[PDB]
């Protein structure tokens, strides 16, 4: 059987991923994640981890946007 | 697809655990007193939350005629109830800090050296499998320290007497496990973790292994002296091997380690004396290490007690299994 | 503070997020390396993140529940915020787990062991009821769980 | 969770003897005919120790590590008591001959080790006409703690001359023992990440010296390893 090598993701492509969450300053951030992820490969890191990384940012940043917003709502009162 | 998480006690974290025990062990006052205070500060942290709970409610519940409501005017009286407990808590927070330090701080210089000990013997596994030991058992013997303390002394003077008496107990529980050969290793590596002052400046790095000048000496040693001079210049020059007069005697003594030149005795570090033997005479190293470790530990012999079982059964219990 | 700090949320959440997913495994010596190394990359030196996520009140409560005071315990404790992938505990000293369950206790939950007559059974119950669950002697990952 | 323990020969001579006598019972040492017979039992215990401690030095101390059980010792005692539970006129003489063949003769097949074995038995129970080392062993009478007392008189430093081995060997063994502990100390410091050596090591120079040795070795006599040899009658 034809063997496919699927290891890793292309750095060019891995920058595009964070950005595409807009559709579903930012540029410094999209680039940053990559570098942190590159820094984790020192211990060893996988694209699944890279993805896992994103979801928690999105989710928890989204959470605290709202936990701060609920906070600010009382402050306003 | 999983988050690998590992709790392994930090020395920082461990020390404080020991501390807690020691607190209870020394005096029951200190723990009952120390603890109960901290609970009330937490309770007061709770009641603080209950103060600030009311604030959300007021603005939200009606959203109008806030000035009119008497329940609002009551909350003023509740601000006082909060402020009473607040002032109680400020007072309680300040009183203890200065007083509790003294109590708590008495033990920590011990615990740090007790914290060193655990993290050393843990490394022991790495050369030889089955050199792995229950954290529990450690603590069970650490418990034995209070039980067997039995000294009549000044507490600040006794702390250091307890560490010394402890190391011996430590050593012997480890030594049950040790293969004859490894005992020596253990002693040394053990000693290293305890005191890094004696091995001051990369002397160790050279020792571990990571001559146009001399005439009288032997050539196998001469390659090794070349190695030595480069690595530690201050020492080689300080040594005055070149004079080669005090060396002439020392060299020719079998059992030479004991008879280190008396001029230099004052001047040279106690460990450096081995750094000597290594390069000079591998003849004597083995015994050298020993007498060195023996002296630094206080134990005349690096080997532990013999094995006889029945003496060893005493210690045992139904809770843990005996492995030989 | 809300205004000027929620503007720093993005980097706040970056850093925080990164830790959990990657440094769940490392020891504090290795962790701290990367903390500083990425913090300096951000330029946000202060607002150290342990106090950030979990407030004063929380820390004391977990102490209260019989969590180890150790900072690694603080660190690990906050990793329970991770829910997307299941957290796996190494806990030679039961207390970390004990705390976990205990805080869990007056709340829906269950507990079992790898090698257990009731294993498969319990599991099925737990999923349907959505009872939150713990397991004791995980020699490795059970295929069944993939 | 275990009370982990080692089961070994005690390292020191004294220590071997300590265990021997610590483990030994009192009343077996102390009888009506108290000294004449018991005197021979200590010589056994001293005998026993030697053999275990020669093992430190090998191959030349002993060809192989021989498993001298503590049973051999207790067996030897069982014997001694027996021969000695005979009324009187018990003979040293075939003690050593039996002991040689039954207990230790199974352990050794080697001529040269048998040779040395004999030497130790002959020494302790004699018959030649053609008691131990003096400073190390001042003699004692029956009483049990007197035997124990001797051990404190015995030095912590144990050395080849008490073995009858050459002096210069101590140095040899100390060199190696030293090197091993250092080695093992060097190991302790770090946990290696590890790497694929197969792609790299073979590429690496590690196998290359072997090749470079050979190159030089036959260049003059390149003809030698090249040349066909006549298979001959």
Curated annotation (Swiss-Prot), chain D:
May function as a motor for intraflagellar retrograde transport. Functions in cilia biogenesis. May play a role in transport between endoplasmic reticulum and Golgi or organization of the Golgi in cells. This is Cytoplasmic dynein 2 heavy chain 1. The lineage of its organism: Eukaryota, Metazoa, Chordata, Craniata, Vertebrata. Belongs to the dynein heavy chain family. It comes from Homo sapiens. It comes from the Eukaryota. It is found in: Cytoplasm, Cytoskeleton, Cilium axoneme; Cell membrane; Cytoplasm. It is linked to Short-rib thoracic dysplasia 3 with or without polydactyly: A form of short-rib thoracic dysplasia, a group of autosomal recessive ciliopathies that are characterized by a constricted thoracic cage, short ribs, shortened tubular bones, and a 'trident' appearance of the acetabular roof. Polydactyly is variably present. Non-skeletal involvement can include cleft lip/palate as well as anomalies of major organs such as the brain, eye, heart, kidneys, liver, pancreas, intestines, and genitalia. The cytoplasmic dynein complex 2 is probably composed by a heavy chain DYNC2H1 homodimer and a number of DYNC2LI1 light intermediate chains. The chain holds residues 3824 to 4066 of 4307 of the full protein.
């Amino acid at each position: 059987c034809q063997v496919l090598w699927m290891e890793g993701w292309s750095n060019s492509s891995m920058k595009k991923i964070p950005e595409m969450l807009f559709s579903e300053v930012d540029p410094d951030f999209l680039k940053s994640f990559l570098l942190i992820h590159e820094s984790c490969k020192a211990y060893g890191a996988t694209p699944s981890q890279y993805m896992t990384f994103l979801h928690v940012y999105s989710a928890i940043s989204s959470s605290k946007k709202k936990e701060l917003l609920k906070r600010q709502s009382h402050l306003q009162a | 697809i999983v988050t690998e998480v590992n709790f392994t006690t930090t020395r920082s974290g461990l020390r404080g655990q020991l501390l807690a025990l020691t607190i209870q062990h020394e005096k029951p006052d200190l723990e009952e007193q120390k603890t109960k205070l901290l609970q009330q500060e937490e309770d007061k942290k709770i009641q603080l939350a209950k103060l600030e709970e009311s604030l959300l409610e007021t603005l939200a519940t009606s959203q109008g005629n806030i000035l009119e409501n008497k329940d609002l005017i009551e909350s003023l009286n509740q601000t006082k109830a909060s402020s009473a407990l607040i002032q109680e808590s400020l007072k309680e927070s300040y009183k203890l800090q200065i007083s509790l330090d003294q109590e708590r701080d008495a033990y920590l210089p011990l615990a740090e050296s007790a914290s060193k000990m655990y993290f050393i013997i843990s490394d022991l596994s790495k050369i030889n499998n089955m050199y792995r030991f229950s954290l529990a058992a450690f603590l069970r013997l650490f418990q034995r320290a209070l039980q067997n303390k039995q000294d009549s002394e000044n507490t600040e003077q006794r702390i250091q007497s307890l560490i010394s008496s402890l190391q011996h107990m430590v050593y012997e529980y480890i030594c049950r496990c040790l293969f004859k050969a490894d005992q020596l290793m253990f002693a040394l590596h053990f000693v290293r973790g305890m005191h890094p002052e004696l091995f001051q400046e990369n002397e160790w790095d050279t020792f571990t292994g990571v001559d146009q000048l001399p005439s009288w000496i032997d050539q196998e040693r001469s390659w090794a002296v070349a190695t030595l001079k480069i690595a530690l210049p201050s020492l080689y020059q300080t040594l005055c091997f070149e004079d080669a007069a005090l060396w002439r005697t020392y060299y020719n003594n079998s059992m030479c380690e004991q008879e280190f030149p008396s001029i230099l005795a004052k001047k040279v570090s106690l460990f450096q004396q081995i750094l000597v033997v290594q390069v000079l005479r591998p003849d004597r190293l083995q015994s050298a290490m020993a007498l060195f470790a023996c002296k630094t530990l206080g134990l005349k012999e690096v080997s532990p007690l013999p094995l006889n079982l029945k003496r060893l059964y005493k210690e045992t219990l139904e809770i843990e299994p005996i492995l030989i | 503070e809300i205004t000027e700090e929620l503007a720093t949320l993005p980097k706040r959440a970056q850093l925080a997020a990164a830790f959990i997913t990657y440094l769940s495994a490392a020891p504090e010596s290795l962790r701290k390396t990367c903390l500083e190394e990425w913090t300096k990359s951000a330029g946000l030196e202060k607002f150290d993140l342990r106090r950030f996520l979990c407030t004063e009140s929380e820390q004391l409560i977990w102490k209260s529940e019989g969590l180890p005071s150790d900072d690694l315990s603080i660190e690990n404790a906050l990793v329970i915020l991770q829910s997307r992938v299941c957290p796996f505990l190494i806990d030679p000293s039961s207390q970390a787990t004990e705390w976990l369950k205990t805080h869990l206790k007056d709340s829906r939950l269950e507990v079992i062991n790898q090698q257990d007559s009731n294993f498969i059974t319990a599991l099925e119950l737990a999923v349907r009821f959505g009872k939150t669950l713990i397991i004791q002697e995980m020699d490795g990952v059970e295929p069944v769980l993939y | 969770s275990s009370l982990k323990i080692t089961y070994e020969s005690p390292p020191g001579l004294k220590k071997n003897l300590m265990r021997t006598y610590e483990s030994w019972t009192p009343e077996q040492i102390s009888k009506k005919d108290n000294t004449h017979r018991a005197h021979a039992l200590f010589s056994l215990a001293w005998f026993h120790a030697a053999c275990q401690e020669r093992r430190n030095y090998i191959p030349q101390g002993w060809t192989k590590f021989y498993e001298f059980s503590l049973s051999d010792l207790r067996a030897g005692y069982n014997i001694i008591d027996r021969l000695f539970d005979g009324a009187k006129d018990v003979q040293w003489e075939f003690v050593h001959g039996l002991l040689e063949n039954a207990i230790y003769g199974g352990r050794i097949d080697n001529y040269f080790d048998l040779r040395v074995l004999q030497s130790y038995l002959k020494q302790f129970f004699n018959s030649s006409v053609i008691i131990f080392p003096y400073s190390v062993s001042l003699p004692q009478s029956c009483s049990i703690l007197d035997y124990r007392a001797v051990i404190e008189k015995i030095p912590e430093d144990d050395k080849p001359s008490f073995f009858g081995l050459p002096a210069n060997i101590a140095r040899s063994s100390q060199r190696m023992i030293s090197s091993q502990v250092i080695s093992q100390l060097r190991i302790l410091g770090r946990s290696i990440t590890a790497g694929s050596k197969f792609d790299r090591e073979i590429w690496s120079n590690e196998l290359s010296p072997v090749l470079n040795l050979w190159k030089k070795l036959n260049q003059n006599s390149n003809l030698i390893h090249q040349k066909v040899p006549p298979p001959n009658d």
